[PDB]
Amino acid sequence: SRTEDVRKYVVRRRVVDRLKAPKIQRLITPRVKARRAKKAKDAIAKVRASAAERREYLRLIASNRRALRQRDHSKKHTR
């Protein structure tokens, strides 16, 4: 059944003494579970970092255009 350890039921062969037991593959441990979940967290963090980087760049572009708009308006007002 699920939620049951499988290492206990692994077939062991003895030679004449060594008990030969195969290594269990696809045994997802809590260590492996944390490793898998970290990959998804890193991926979503990366795209959010680039989205924040795009926002800052767009702010710089817009602010520079705004400053030039404010410069000539003040010059026209002082004209």
Binding site: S50, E53, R54, E56, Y57, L60, I61, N64
Partner: protein
Amino acid sequence: AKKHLKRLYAPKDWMLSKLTGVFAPRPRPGPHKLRECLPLLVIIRNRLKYALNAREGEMILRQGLVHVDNHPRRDGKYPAGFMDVVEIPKTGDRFRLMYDVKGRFALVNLSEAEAQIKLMKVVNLYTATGRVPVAVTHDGHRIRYPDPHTSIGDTIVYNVKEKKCVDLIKNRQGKAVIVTGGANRGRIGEIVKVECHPGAFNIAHLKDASGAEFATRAANIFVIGKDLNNLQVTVPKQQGLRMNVIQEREERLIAAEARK
């Protein structure tokens, strides 16, 4: 493709003797061109003499003891070209690869907070997907959001540790440059004018500190500061000043006799 490099075909700046062996370390593709690079194995063995042969060079390099641009490199065929910061933490060396007045590769010793700064020449600008401006540098770096005033030919001073751009130096007349190719390689001068020839090669006319005028193609210049008195990077001892051959020979004879 070609995997080998004959020693006679290797660049002369590597200073490999023609009688020592048939082959030279073939530089792998990477940040710098094969003809304009200095392989890590050459640096650790022939330049620094930390390794007596290639076997000890691989032992040092494959351990990750050598850092280029704040990142360990385990490959002795790594290009490691111009204006690269090479540091060995186990010994604390921290030099930068530059050109002397002869055009040979020079290991300019760096200090703390100077090994964090690298100068990159912008060779191409393009728009990536999502309307993202990207600048390609001379060492193969792609900057995802360069300064809006950046143009091809300008140089970006870059923080290798922080992985971000700190300032921009524009390619204009009156700025200090260093020649990275041709017969004038390693000379430092100030831009006087740029002869623009569409389709052909643009010609830059420069003048050094002494006052000598020399020219080169615009692709061989590398802006390094606002003017000759203000350089953002430390240059080798000669300060990019080419000396007369007759004068240099006499000085060496006088100095040699003075020592003895």
